[PDB]
Amino acid sequence: AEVTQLSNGIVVATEHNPSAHTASVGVVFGSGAANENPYNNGVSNLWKNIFLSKENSAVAAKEGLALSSNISRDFQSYIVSSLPGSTDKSLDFLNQSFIQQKANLLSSSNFEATKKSVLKQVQDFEDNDHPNRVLEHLHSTAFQNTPLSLPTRGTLESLENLVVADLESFANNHFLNSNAVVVGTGNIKHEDLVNSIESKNLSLQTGTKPVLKKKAAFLGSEVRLRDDTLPKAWISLAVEGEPVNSPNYFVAKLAAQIFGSYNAFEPASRLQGIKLLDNIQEYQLCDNFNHFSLSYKDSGLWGFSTATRNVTMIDDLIHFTLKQWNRLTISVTDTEVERAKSLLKLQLGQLYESGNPVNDANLLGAEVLIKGSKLSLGEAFKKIDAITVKDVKAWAGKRLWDQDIAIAGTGQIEGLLDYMRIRSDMSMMRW
Template identity: 35%
Template sequence: MLRLTARQSKTISSVARRNLVSFSGAKTKTTTLPNGFTVASETIPGASTATVGVWVDSGSRAENAYNNGTANVFEHIAFKGTQSRSQQKLIQDIEAVGGEFSAYTNLENSAFYAKSLKEDVPKTVELISDMLKNTKIDNSTIEAERSSLLAQAEAVEANYKQTVFDHLHATAFQQQGLGRTIIGPADNVVSITETEVSKYVSGAIKADKLVLVGAGNVEHEQLVTLAQKHFAGLPASTPASQFGTTKASSEDANQYKKPVFIGSEVRLRDDTMPVAYIAIAVEGVSKSSPDYFTAQVAAAVIGNWSAKSSSALFQGSKLAALAAQEKFALSFESFSKSYTDTGLWGIYFTTNVVDRIDDVSHFALKEWNKLSTSVSQADVERAKAAVKAQLILSLDSADAVAKDIGESIVNTGRRVTAEEIERSVEKVTDAQVRAWAQKNLYDQDIAISALGPIEGLLDYLRIRNDMSMMRW
């Protein structure tokens, strides 16, 4: 059966004769093989190179407390050789196509992709399929990579912003998949063996959990042919997996229909540090929520600011103007992080004026409260322009487009086009922002993560009380 999207002229492709399910969006074309394997591509006019890769509908969230970090280990050893290629041969074949191979793992998915010339796309797809389907998984390979994994963990600890956000997730989603780090605890890093990795791969590398993505100088028909050649024999999950559904491990001790947000805090006080790093958040919205863009606009109303910016004194955000005037912070950024079935919405700030930490948190939450009562259409219009610039202009390369296609499909089941984004953002009104804030911000529990000289950060209940103060 062939199904095509509306709102455009349609031509029946030859894929219809091969029992494939094919869709053509305004730009992104998708085809599903009989075994559930998905192919998605977007041709970028004028592009001289192609980015192709496989996105996997499984990340660290699919792990449990005992094997947390396994997806990251698999990402590392995938480049160390396959059943038919030694590490040296794999590297030589990668160099032969002149490609730039990359991989990453996040909470909900993993990706293995490369940039190459159009004529090298077939070889690139073959290499990636071999790396995923025939990875050499043995204890000697894992042990050889152990030092690199530990060095990666140390690098994350040295990244204070990442550390704060890791702890923010850990306290907000305690003992749940979203509360665990991508790298995993040190005890797991040194103890994971081929048993854990093999079990993870056997569940993750399934036809209905993979998307072959192409962006740039690519042809969709060619990618479909390559997918049939290299992935048509891959089995599907039992029971069948569906994109956009909960990513939690079936072996996790804490199983919920959706993650449970817990109002709580974690404080890592270190008075030897010159700067305090603090994040405060409420439960956010999922990527498929009808309020997704409203939450993005609400965050943009609060805005981002840095004392280093040449326009620090002239930004439209009221909190930015106050920070520039009072000089009580070095920077702040609002965020709306969304996952398959939940999210985190909040603010992250840094300050070296440790006796005014309470001022920063107090005035930030005061601006949050104003979203419930007095946000203006002018504020919303400014925020909408910022959101559109961030979401649309960020797709400035084939790599970025490929990542957006891959993550969109595995997380929501479909790719939202730039035109849809623009229309959805444009529809957001001040009344919608107020309604969203009254439901999701006013008198809601918060999660706090703080690192550094944080003695001036007042107790949790004092900060929590600011969530319901409506007048000053």
């Protein structure tokens, strides 16, 4: 439970844990899909793919190292996992790929083979992963003509028109030192890693800063991807949520826990202490749903996603769900809040403390890049337990009550009513 972070020439962040069996090392840059353009959209995802290319991956496999990368909206990460003893050989492969081979990975035979793979990759996503496809379009319409609208995997049209030069241009503008953080998770000590880093000098493009842009903004709107050939309807609906480092960061996440997630086929899920379940189970309004409180640097999204085969009652699904959310402003109970606290801790714990260091790296990296530090799991619980019904009400009355929404859906959505009908349900009539 130690969050150590020091700065020499580069900012080093680590979180050591005795028993772990393995150690993960990697660099996390403060720029992701939110930094791209509509035309070079997908460059970051492309970088990730060559970094994991058969060539670069085989070089690490001989050495007994495993590679992992993750492209997000606000950040980007390249991670190498190793045994606690080879904590130095991971750094050799890291530097060898970001300075030495930052020209060998970009060969005309490797690039074309990779491009052909991310194309079949992004295509497969759009053709079959409907729930994530819908969630991606939700960001697209909610944050249209703004940084958060760009999809992480990039679009097919911007991808196929991408060249080696675009990779370089992005790398020379974002893979900078002032826009990076070296992260180490597993079991290795902070002093053990910082020494191996401060050993090898050479700045390489120091003092250089990444380009600036315009602030992200939420726009109440919708995108309907109707497709009657699909056997279900997948929808996602949300309001402007909370950005990371917001006073209500936790109040929002708790609010989403109150309604939680559901799976009609799992006996135990049908028994949860969620009032909404009394309404949706009678006629089986859906196969599943899940609420979320997505947070990013400039903004976020609070809402839910759902999947259903009850195509003639989608209006009841949306109506009952929105009536429940109305409650947060006027009648949420003490016990609902308390149930949420307990469940929020359990989920927040299971995330922050998993038996996998690669997840730890992403969580640590993403946090330190935005606030310059990481809030300890024990510190979070103190904030969570401090939330009162009055807090949730004040939050809901500002973020949910009579506020614009963003909608996205695909499949048999003929039954999903017009925007104004959904929007009207964001409140209730009163004397």
